[PDB]
């Protein structure tokens, strides 16, 4: 289905393909804004809210072919034939899945701290507990919500990231569905090889793109290029946006 988006025209015409930015689990279209603010200098930008996030529609189904189709439907809605896609984590998996569903609609591809693999672990139980605790309380403001979340989480950055989706005393993301479909989100459906250069940007202090996932990564992205950002965790763009942008532009210029 069509997604909620925020589009901005390039400040300068350079004959570049437009860039679609796709956030990760519990995120919203504002999360990759730091990248959009730089890339809009020479590209039309489209920031999307993934289904069940932000102000995009809710749907009980949450799998990658579905998220990939949403991207196609969104491109069709904006009458864009082909675009470069940049996705973080879950968003990166949606973009990678798009290569299998509609390769002709993709120009270049950037996957931030994510590998095309089923991680086979639960990594968000405490986050779900914090989210539910906030909902069960009488918290209305982000300050009140933060106080409760700190009782479950000790990573202030994660708490603030989640709170970007706490508005009018309600979570923007669809909690029951993200919980129910969680295995499919941390999971993956293997795809055919995409024989085109693809950029992967892992955080040096993150296990999302470690060596144990390399064989599977290359089997699906034979021409994958990895640019590890030293001293960065999972939300690489939030910690080292400059380093991420340098890697992105080097790839986009493909000299």
Helix-strand pattern, N to C?
EEHEHEHEHHHEEHHEHEHH
Strand segment count: 9
Assigned CATH superfamily: Alpha/Beta hydrolase fold, catalytic domain
Secondary structure: helix percent:
25-40%
Biggest sheet character: 7 strands, mixed
CATH class: Alpha Beta
Radius of gyration: 17 Å
> Which structural class should the secondary elements be placed in?
alpha/beta
Structure description:
The chain is α/β, with parallel strands linked by helices and 255 residues long. It has one domain (1-255): Rossmann fold (3-Layer(aba) Sandwich), CATH 3.40.50. The protein contains eleven helices and nine strands. It has helices at residues 33-39, 64-77, 90-101, 125-136, 142-149, 156-163, 175-180, 182-186, 214-220, 236-239, 241-253, and strands at residues 5-8, 19-22, 45-48, 83-88, 106-112, 166-167, 170-171, 198-201, 224-226. The strands form two sheets. It has a seven-stranded mixed sheet with strand order 1-3-2-4-5-8-9, with helices on both faces. Strands 6-7 form a two-stranded antiparallel ribbon. Helix 3 links the parallel strand 4 and strand 5 (106-112). The longest helix is centred in the first third of the chain and has 14 residues, at 64-77.
